[PDB]
Protein backbone atom coordinates (compact mmCIF):
# COMPACT_ATOMS: atom_id res chain seq x y z
CA UNK A 1 0.00 0.00 0.00
CA UNK A 2 1.05 3.57 -0.68
CA UNK A 3 -1.15 5.29 1.89
CA UNK A 4 -0.41 5.06 5.66
CA UNK A 5 -2.89 2.32 6.45
CA UNK A 6 -5.01 2.68 9.56
CA UNK A 7 -6.84 -0.44 10.71
CA UNK A 8 -10.48 -0.13 11.61
CA UNK A 9 -10.25 -1.42 15.15
CA UNK A 10 -11.93 0.76 17.83
CA UNK A 11 -8.61 0.57 19.61
CA UNK A 12 -5.65 -0.88 17.76
CA UNK A 13 -3.41 -1.72 20.68
CA UNK A 14 -1.00 -3.44 18.30
CA UNK A 15 0.32 -0.62 16.13
CA UNK A 16 0.50 1.31 19.40
CA UNK A 17 2.26 -1.68 21.00
CA UNK A 18 5.11 -0.87 18.64
CA UNK A 19 7.29 2.22 18.90
CA UNK A 20 7.97 3.83 15.54
CA UNK A 21 7.91 0.59 13.59
CA UNK A 22 4.53 -1.06 13.08
CA UNK A 23 6.36 -3.93 11.32
CA UNK A 24 4.59 -2.76 8.15
CA UNK A 25 2.34 -5.74 8.83
CA UNK A 26 0.14 -7.18 6.08
CA UNK A 27 -2.98 -5.04 6.22
CA UNK A 28 -5.83 -7.42 5.63
CA UNK A 29 -8.95 -6.46 3.77
CA UNK A 30 -12.19 -7.90 5.13
CA UNK A 31 -12.82 -11.24 3.33
CA UNK A 32 -16.00 -11.68 1.32
CA UNK A 33 -15.80 -15.46 1.25
CA UNK A 34 -17.35 -17.09 2.99
CA UNK A 35 -20.04 -14.49 3.70
CA UNK A 36 -20.46 -15.69 7.29
CA UNK A 37 -16.73 -15.10 7.78
CA UNK A 38 -17.12 -11.55 6.50
CA UNK A 39 -20.03 -11.15 8.90
CA UNK A 40 -17.93 -12.48 11.78
CA UNK A 41 -15.12 -10.10 10.87
CA UNK A 42 -17.40 -7.19 11.77
CA UNK A 43 -17.90 -8.62 15.26
CA UNK A 44 -14.25 -8.07 16.19
CA UNK A 45 -14.43 -4.38 15.37
CA UNK A 46 -17.97 -3.96 16.66
CA UNK A 47 -18.90 -2.45 13.32
CA UNK A 48 -21.64 -2.95 10.77
CA UNK A 49 -21.40 -3.77 7.06
CA UNK A 50 -22.26 -0.26 5.87
CA UNK A 51 -19.60 0.91 8.29
CA UNK A 52 -16.85 -1.42 7.11
CA UNK A 53 -14.92 -2.79 4.11
CA UNK A 54 -14.44 0.58 2.38
CA UNK A 55 -11.56 2.09 4.36
CA UNK A 56 -11.50 -0.34 7.26
CA UNK A 57 -8.53 -2.69 7.26
CA UNK A 58 -7.14 -5.12 9.82
CA UNK A 59 -3.55 -5.59 10.98
CA UNK A 60 -2.22 -9.14 10.69
CA UNK A 61 -1.24 -8.61 14.32
CA UNK A 62 -4.88 -9.16 15.26
CA UNK A 63 -4.50 -12.87 14.50
CA UNK A 64 -2.97 -15.69 16.51
CA UNK A 65 -0.49 -16.65 13.83
CA UNK A 66 -0.89 -13.51 11.75
CA UNK A 67 -2.68 -15.50 9.07
CA UNK A 68 -6.03 -14.77 7.45
CA UNK A 69 -7.39 -17.68 5.43
CA UNK A 70 -11.14 -18.32 5.34
CA UNK A 71 -11.99 -19.06 8.95
CA UNK A 72 -9.95 -16.54 10.88
CA UNK A 73 -11.55 -13.50 12.50
CA UNK A 74 -9.40 -10.67 13.96
CA UNK A 75 -9.16 -10.23 17.72
CA UNK A 76 -8.26 -7.24 19.94
CA UNK A 77 -5.45 -9.17 21.60
CA UNK A 78 -4.70 -12.83 20.72
CA UNK A 79 -2.54 -12.91 23.83
CA UNK A 80 -5.49 -11.97 26.06
CA UNK A 81 -8.84 -12.35 24.29
CA UNK A 82 -10.40 -15.33 22.55
CA UNK A 83 -9.10 -15.67 18.99
CA UNK A 84 -12.34 -15.89 17.02
CA UNK A 85 -12.04 -18.62 14.42
CA UNK A 86 -14.63 -20.61 12.51
CA UNK A 87 -14.85 -24.03 10.95
CA UNK A 88 -15.67 -23.34 7.33
CA UNK A 89 -17.80 -26.06 5.67
CA UNK A 90 -15.47 -28.08 3.40
CA UNK A 91 -16.66 -27.12 -0.10
ZN1 LIG B 1 -4.78 -2.86 14.11
Swiss-Prot record:
<comment type="subunit">
    <text>Homodimer.</text>
</comment>
<comment type="similarity">
    <text>Belongs to the D-isomer specific 2-hydroxyacid dehydrogenase family.</text>
</comment>
<protein>
    <recommendedName>
        <fullName>C-terminal-binding protein 1</fullName>
    </recommendedName>
</protein>
<comment type="function">
    <text>Binds DNA and represses gene expression. Plays a role in regulation of life span, possibly by regulating transcription of genes important for lipid metabolism.</text>
</comment>
<feature type="zinc finger region" description="THAP-type">
    <location>
        <begin position="7"/>
        <end position="62"/>
    </location>
</feature>
<feature type="compositionally biased region" description="Basic and acidic residues">
    <location>
        <begin position="79"/>
        <end position="91"/>
    </location>
</feature>
Amino acid sequence: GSMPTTCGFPNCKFRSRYRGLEDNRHFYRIPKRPLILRQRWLTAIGRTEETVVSQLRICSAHFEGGEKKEGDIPVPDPTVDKQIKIELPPK
